Design a protein around this ligand. Structure first.
Ligand code: HEM
Ligand code: SAW
Ligand code: K
Length: 405
């Protein structure tokens, strides 16, 4: 359905982009969004899809809106409006100033010093998954490596038992891959039902895991509440799953299809960190947004209080104004500009953990299974949304060209 054009929106700014089903998704999801950057498209447009909303199409405006939390609030960060409204995760549904110290607390459990300590456990996990796949000469990468990898890292961080993985995967999938059978609010309650008792337990008998640290933390000069701890834990769990799963999948699809780029990393593994950054730019995948706190004129366009604006993190690095020949992958790009991990006060806290997951995966995969392809006859299908992704990724290789390391 197209929503009726609100009378403050001029007709020349209307471009009916559907973020959940863009036209020619078949060409690749990044390509499908990049239609918003063709020369006849304004910097700021209105779509009548999904209830109707603004979209900033260029890196400059995306960055500016993410900086201006006074006008562009995270209270309602999702399209459609109803999903944005039910959402109470911390710190993502909060604005500064209140967000600041909640962010600080979350940083204790996923920040840089935690990542340095986790490095080897990440590597051991990646090695075990890859070795289990290696002799088979095939996998669905998305299902067989990408899905099991970040959830296992979360269990380690949060001191949760291995036996809980399938149940927790079921609860998270319900929420982030909705099939229309339940509202966000319903899926959130089912997730909270799992987390609530564990938080109770760890406030009574705290350990040294991430949930204990969060649930017993201090925020704005007082103890965190049980409610706030649950809202934080929900985000700590969800934030590192679909992003990492889908990003690894885009990266491995590209490498399967590009033996010349693959060969570059096989011959020069020291370039893998730079390659990781270039892939983060080219296969950027997140698109959330904000809600107007007041009427506001922004780059010559009148916005009204309560309008939603999609600010696609994906688009900044694809903008030719930010990076020349933006669809071309070059691992030696001198200045790799992107907002893949967002921008402003909510810039991803898990970005350091994410880069280690990516670099460790690429280094270990390329060492053990250097030569692989898309399965004969397969066509890769993408999906579009708040976190865009890969539906399935069938890969094949000759086990004789691999090595058990
Ligand atoms: C490729 C991987 C990742 C991508 C592309 C990504 C992307 C993002 C983006 C764009 C935001 C900001 C959203 C907004 O401004 O509304 C964000 C926030 C956040 N991310 Fe990530 N993320 C990734 C991995 C992770 C991981 C592994 C974790 C670990 C739990 C994580 C935890 C968080 C947290 C806690 C926030 C909220 C920070 C705040 O609100 O102050 N992320 N992420
Ligand atoms: C017709 N109408 C009115 C409709 C009704 C109902 C549903 C509809 C859908 S829908 O069924 O596709 N629903 C929208 C998708 C909701 C997903 C939110 C999940 C929250 C967890 N993620 C995070 O917190 C985040 C928070 C940060 C930013 C990202 C990435 C993160 O890492 C970090 C995790 C998200 C589509 C179109 C229309 C619909
Ligand atoms: K909300």
């Amino acid at each position: 359905n197209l929503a009726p054009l609100p009378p403050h929106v001029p007709e020349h700014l209307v471009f009916d982009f559907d973020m959940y089903n863009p036209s020619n998704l078949s060409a690749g999801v990044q390509e499908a969004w990049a239609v918003l950057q063709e020369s006849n498209v304004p910097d700021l447009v209105w779509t009548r899809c999904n209830g109707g909303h603004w979209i900033a199409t260029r890196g400059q405006l995306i960055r500016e809106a993410y900086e201006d939390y006074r006008h562009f609030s995270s209270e309602c960060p999702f399209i459609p409006r109803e999903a944005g409204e039910a959402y109470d995760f911390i710190p993502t549904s909060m604005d500064p100033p209140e967000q600041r110290q909640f962010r600080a607390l979350a940083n204790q459990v996923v920040g840089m010093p935690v990542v340095d300590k986790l490095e080897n456990r990440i590597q051991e996990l990646a090695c075990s998954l890859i070795e289990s796949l290696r002799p088979q000469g095939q996998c669905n990468f998305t299902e067989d490596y990408a899905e099991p990898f970040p959830i296992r890292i979360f269990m380690l961080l949060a001191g949760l038992p291995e036996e809980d993985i399938p149940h927790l995967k079921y609860l998270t999938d319900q929420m982030t891959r909705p099939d229309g059978s339940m509202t966000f609010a319903e899926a959130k309650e089912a997730l909270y039902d799992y987390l609530i008792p564990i938080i109770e337990q760890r406030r009574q008998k705290p350990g040294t895991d991430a949930i204990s640290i969060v649930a017993n933390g201090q925020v704005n000069g007082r103890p965190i509440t049980s409610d706030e701890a649950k809202r934080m834990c929900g985000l700590l769990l969800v934030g590192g799953l679909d992003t990492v799963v889908n990003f690894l999948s885009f990266s491995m699809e590209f490498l399967a299809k590009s033996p010349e780029h693959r060969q570059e990393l096989i011959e020069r593994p020291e370039r893998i960190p730079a390659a990781c950054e270039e892939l983060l730019r080219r296969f950027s995948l997140v698109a959330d947004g904000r809600i107007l706190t007041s009427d506001y004129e922004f780059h010559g366009v009148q916005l009204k209080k309560g309008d939603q604006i999609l600010l696609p993190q994906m688009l900044s690095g694809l903008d030719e104004r930010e990076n020349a020949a933006p669809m071309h992958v070059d691992f030696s790009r001198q200045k790799v500009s992107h907002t893949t991990f967002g921008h402003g006060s909510h810039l991803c806290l898990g970005q350091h953990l994410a880069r280690r997951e990516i670099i460790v995966t690429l280094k270990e995969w390329l060492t053990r299974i250097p030569d692989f392809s898309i399965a004969p006859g397969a066509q890769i299908q993408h999906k579009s949304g708040i976190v865009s992704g890969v539906q399935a990724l069938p890969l094949v290789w000759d086990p004789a060209t691999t090595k058990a390391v």
